[PDB]
Structure 1
Amino acid sequence: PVSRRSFPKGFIFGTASSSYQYEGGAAEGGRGPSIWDTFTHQHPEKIADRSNGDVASDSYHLYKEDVRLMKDMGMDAYRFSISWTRILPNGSLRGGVNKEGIKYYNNLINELLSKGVQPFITLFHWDSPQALEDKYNGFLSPNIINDFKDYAEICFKEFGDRVKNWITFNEPWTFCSNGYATGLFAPGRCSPWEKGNCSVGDSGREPYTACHHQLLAHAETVRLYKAKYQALQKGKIGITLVSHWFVPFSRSKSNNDAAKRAIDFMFGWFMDPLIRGDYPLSMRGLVGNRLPQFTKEQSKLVKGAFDFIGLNYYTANYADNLPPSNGLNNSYTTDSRANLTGVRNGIPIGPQAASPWLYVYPQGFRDLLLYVKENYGNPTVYITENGVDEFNNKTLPLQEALKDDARIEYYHKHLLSLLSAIRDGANVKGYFAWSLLDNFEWSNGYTVRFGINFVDYNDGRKRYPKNSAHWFKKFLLK
């Protein structure tokens, strides 16, 4: 069949979570508001079930139970994120350090290590400080860089004696496209005609400005870590990027070039700068002056600025050539001149999960990993997220909700697909399942469940292992 035994010796298995989706205690322990507190409370129409992360999965109180669950599966590692506003309630150093917040993350870190689970920490998982949003529009201003740098530094000082694995940003693609092009995610900015129908924004500039600043904050932080912390702490620092796999809509060459543009715009947007020191040619060509430019100093800094790359994979799309549109309607969403669908002639590329955008296509996992090997020099890679969701359904009896054979099937195929890619050259060192628990799934609220364990939101946030948890327990033996 397949088990951890099939994978290289020393290969790491774990689960992933994020602060805002899991923690709750949104206003406890001195936590300041994030742009997602604001977004969920001020724009409930923009959340499927009009909900928020106030309580979420209550990991702020329940983290000991969480650790116990992952130890029982036999996980090696846990990827979680630190809430910026839990450490610095208004984003900046001069705003004050929150000692109760530090205490929380020490508690979790120590709990994890006491059970032999390695902590991998994400610094930014979208919960950007409201105070910095109000002050200078957050990631739209270059001031974000030094504030982020100071926040990372406090984390290295407080936790770096025990934490040896650091991720700066999680899926900057999703943050920038949904936060600034579609406006469907916090901070909910977009051009007035775009899907989010936002009161402020510019879908043709802001996504590029925000992500340019994320890259610079990342590289700056990497340099800081390598200069002051890596010698005496000996940890690794990286970044998490998401990519779909893009299948050409037909065998034509223009559709093959469309697929290439799709991956350049989603993935290369961040990979090209890190490997080659510049944005992809196609982006520079098609976007011109709306895409900011690295100085030579900055180009030098970003190139090679990582020890590993975290890769998130979920699904694949068909990529179809799009004619230009254009001139007044410029948006990041259409800038690639590619049309992405999950359906071709009424036939979905794979079976569709609870999330409309998620099609089950294990073949694409292999394809993406080999593409990274061949086009980017085969960098050290962790799979930082991979998973699937079922609907939250109030009518199902508990015992039925725990029967998640679709999830088992998803992981089985995807772990086989990952194995075959490793058996070819893929430089993959670990894998993290999204996610340990059902959680706040952003604009979908609690309408969907990604967890390997069930969370009863109506019964005190109780955790119940799903069938897939028992499956992982077997998969992870010895």
Structure 2
Amino acid sequence: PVSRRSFPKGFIFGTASSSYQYEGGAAEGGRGPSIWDTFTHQHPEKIADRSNGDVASDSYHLYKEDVRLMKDMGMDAYRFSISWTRILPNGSLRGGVNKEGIKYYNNLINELLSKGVQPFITLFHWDSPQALEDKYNGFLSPNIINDFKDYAEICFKEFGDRVKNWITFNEPWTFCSNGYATGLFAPGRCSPWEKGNCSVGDSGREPYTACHHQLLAHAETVRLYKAKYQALQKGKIGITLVSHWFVPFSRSKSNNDAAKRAIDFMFGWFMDPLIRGDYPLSMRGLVGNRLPQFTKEQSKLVKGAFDFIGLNYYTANYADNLPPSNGLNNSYTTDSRANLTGVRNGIPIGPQAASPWLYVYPQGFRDLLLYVKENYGNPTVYITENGVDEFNNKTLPLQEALKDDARIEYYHKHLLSLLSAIRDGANVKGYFAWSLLDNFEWSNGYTVRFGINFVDYNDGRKRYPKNSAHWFKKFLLK
């Protein structure tokens, strides 16, 4: 018990959102379709409630209320994402620049600043242009790099006078693993035997190609930022990565080496190229010629290409050793030879949230942060996402739905765990809660609510503060 005053001076507290999950106005103000527009409309069976982001939380119209809601809590900063196809309706410069899209984000930024809230902007939060998907399969083509670079530069030119904090990509792990290994997220590609039962793809090659291309697009974009923009705009640029914490299934050395392989595959996949200039050893060994290779020039470009690392933490998994399968079912999912579970001998690692993958384990938050400290030279970190969900329940009266004690408990323990890690030397500068509002939770649609504020989808998307909102107001005092 635990308040802002417990944290170092200058420490930043905020909330996070993303364009597709919040904005709505999908076909409004000249916005082009993204792969998630396509994905939700053509494959509604892949969304738990067959829903889409057409309206979402209507932030495109209601963003002033959002800023008001953050301000009432005393938030320092807002993490949001720009929709690529709101700026470049068909992905590329030559396809035309959408003026009305630029106006919207200017309005959002100006509104935030008029109320003392600093904007942290994610360039890519999965809403990849459909036109570039159709043209060359999006991130499976090296052509994506320049189109991304051109998109990024328009953001630097239009917004960089006021925006001082930039994130290139959000959770490339999630994007690549779910989009191309399991095919459960857009663009919904995978091997036929894999979970998404996709019509096209290869779970053993495509995840790696996609993410390789994201890393190159990231590095190119950082380089560009530092070369042309950083001198006069004096902002910072980084990237947001997820990691679970991995507890060895038992005390055996092989289970310990599995947990190490799990983290190498989920997290080191991006961290090692960024810190050491190449993919993890276990990745190059186990994946072989299915993993692309950096040229010497590419390695130089990727190494050290960041001002900070955004870190997302939600849960822990047990990690157990797995024999090679051995043969013709190569998938990124199994490539690690680590079997991931949240339950061990019928005992869940922590209480299970509404998301079936989300188990409450505050300990691992600290563990992850210290792992980063000890193994990656303690880089500047912001916690770009942390949070939990409850079910969307149409039978509960409104006032019962606002009582999110489980969320308060989640934040209480995780903030304590974050504090202890900081006190033990973790180079952490800020913290963003996922998320400000209930929103479109991807393949879970609206069946699940992550918000500190309730959104009534059946009453014009009206916002209501949950109990946790009040809790954060207290916490954020002075």
Which TM-score band applies after superposition, normalised by the shorter structure? over 0.9
Instruction: Give deviations 1:301-327, integer Å, cap 9, x for gaps.
Output: 000000000000000000000000022
Report the equivalent of 1:261. Answer: 261
Partner of 2:184, secondary structure, is: coil
Confirm whether residue 79 of structure 1 aligns to residue 79 of structure 2: yes
The Cα of 1:83 is off from its aligned counterpart by: 0.1
The Cα of 1:24 is off from its aligned counterpart by: 0.2
The Cα of 1:10 is off from its aligned counterpart by: 0.3
Instruction: Give deviations 1:443-475, integer Å, cap 9, x for gaps.
Output: 000000000000000000000000000000000
Q: Which runs of 5+ in 1 are unaligned?
A: none
Instruction: Give deviations 1:49-79, integer Å, cap 9, x for gaps.
Output: 0000000000000000000000000000000
- Provide the C-alpha distance between the structure 2 equivalents of 1:319 and 1:192, rounded to a whole number of angstroms: 26
- Provide the C-alpha distance between the structure 2 equivalents of 1:399 and 1:11, rounded to a whole number of angstroms: 33
- Provide the C-alpha distance between the structure 2 equivalents of 1:295 and 1:262, rounded to a whole number of angstroms: 26
Instruction: Give deviations 1:384-418, integer Å, cap 9, x for gaps.
Output: 00000000000000000000000000000000000
Runs of 4+ in structure 1 over 4 Å off: none
Partner of 1:247, secondary structure, is: strand
Report the equivalent of 1:131. Answer: 131
Partner of 1:128, secondary structure, is: coil
- Provide the C-alpha distance between the structure 2 equivalents of 1:433 and 1:446, rounded to a whole number of angstroms: 19
The Cα of 1:212 is off from its aligned counterpart by: 0.1
Report the equivalent of 1:334. Answer: 334
Instruction: Give deviations 1:335-374, integer Å, cap 9, x for gaps.
Output: 0000000000000000000000000000000000000000
- Provide the C-alpha distance between the structure 2 equivalents of 1:76 and 1:148, rounded to a whole number of angstroms: 29
Partner of 2:102, secondary structure, is: helix
Partner of 2:95, secondary structure, is: coil
Instruction: Give deviations 1:240-279, integer Å, cap 9, x for gaps.
Output: 0000000000000000000000000000000000000000
Partner of 1:254, secondary structure, is: helix
The Cα of 1:160 is off from its aligned counterpart by: 0.1
Corresponding residue pairs, total: 478
Instruction: Give deviations 1:37-56, integer Å, cap 9, x for gaps.
Output: 00000000000000000000
- Provide the C-alpha distance between the structure 2 equivalents of 1:344 and 1:332, rounded to a whole number of angstroms: 23
Instruction: Give deviations 1:420-451, integer Å, cap 9, x for gaps.
Output: 00000100000000000000000000000000
Partner of 1:30, secondary structure, is: coil
Confirm whether residue 57 of structure 1 aligns to residue 57 of structure 2: yes
- Provide the C-alpha distance between the structure 2 equivalents of 1:24 and 1:70, rounded to a whole number of angstroms: 19
- Provide the C-alpha distance between the structure 1 equivalents of 2:381 and 2:369, rounded to a whole number of angstroms: 9
Partner of 1:377, secondary structure, is: coil
The Cα of 1:293 is off from its aligned counterpart by: 0.1
Instruction: Give deviations 1:207-261, integer Å, cap 9, x for gaps.
Output: 0000000000000000000000000000000000000000000000000000000
Partner of 1:455, secondary structure, is: strand
Report the equivalent of 1:101. Answer: 101
Confirm whether residue 349 of structure 1 aligns to residue 338 of structure 2: no
Report the equivalent of 1:411. Answer: 411
The Cα of 1:20 is off from its aligned counterpart by: 0.1
- Provide the C-alpha distance between the structure 2 equivalents of 1:327 and 1:134, rounded to a whole number of angstroms: 32
Report the equivalent of 2:308. Answer: 308
- Provide the C-alpha distance between the structure 2 equivalents of 1:326 and 1:186, rounded to a whole number of angstroms: 28
- Give matches, 1:20-39, under 5 Å: 20-39=20-39
- Provide the C-alpha distance between the structure 2 equivalents of 1:327 and 1:300, rounded to a whole number of angstroms: 34
Partner of 2:75, secondary structure, is: coil
- Provide the C-alpha distance between the structure 2 equivalents of 1:20 and 1:180, rounded to a whole number of angstroms: 19
- Provide the C-alpha distance between the structure 2 equivalents of 1:244 and 1:463, rounded to a whole number of angstroms: 31
Report the equivalent of 2:443. Answer: 443
The Cα of 1:15 is off from its aligned counterpart by: 0.1
Partner of 1:94, secondary structure, is: helix
Partner of 2:100, secondary structure, is: helix
The Cα of 1:169 is off from its aligned counterpart by: 0.0
- Provide the C-alpha distance between the structure 2 equivalents of 1:7 and 1:446, rounded to a whole number of angstroms: 34
Q: Over aligned residues, Cα RMSD in angstroms?
A: 0.2
- Give matches, 1:356-375, under 5 Å: 356-375=356-375
Q: Which runs of 5+ in 2 are unaligned?
A: none
Report the equivalent of 2:221. Answer: 221
Partner of 1:123, secondary structure, is: strand
The Cα of 1:173 is off from its aligned counterpart by: 0.1
Q: Give the alignment's TM-score, normalised by structure 1.
A: 1.00
Partner of 1:212, secondary structure, is: helix
- Provide the C-alpha distance between the structure 1 equivalents of 2:257 and 2:180, rounded to a whole number of angstroms: 26
- Provide the C-alpha distance between the structure 2 equivalents of 1:249 and 1:8, rounded to a whole number of angstroms: 36
- Provide the C-alpha distance between the structure 2 equivalents of 1:366 and 1:311, rounded to a whole number of angstroms: 12
- Provide the C-alpha distance between the structure 2 equivalents of 1:133 and 1:344, rounded to a whole number of angstroms: 41
The Cα of 1:143 is off from its aligned counterpart by: 0.1
The Cα of 1:282 is off from its aligned counterpart by: 0.2
Instruction: Give deviations 1:8-33, integer Å, cap 9, x for gaps.
Output: 00000000000000000000000000
Instruction: Give deviations 1:154-175, integer Å, cap 9, x for gaps.
Output: 0000000000000000000000
Q: Give the alignment's TM-score, normalised by structure 2.
A: 1.00
- Provide the C-alpha distance between the structure 2 equivalents of 1:358 and 1:74, rounded to a whole number of angstroms: 28
Instruction: Give deviations 1:97-129, integer Å, cap 9, x for gaps.
Output: 000000000000000000000000000000000
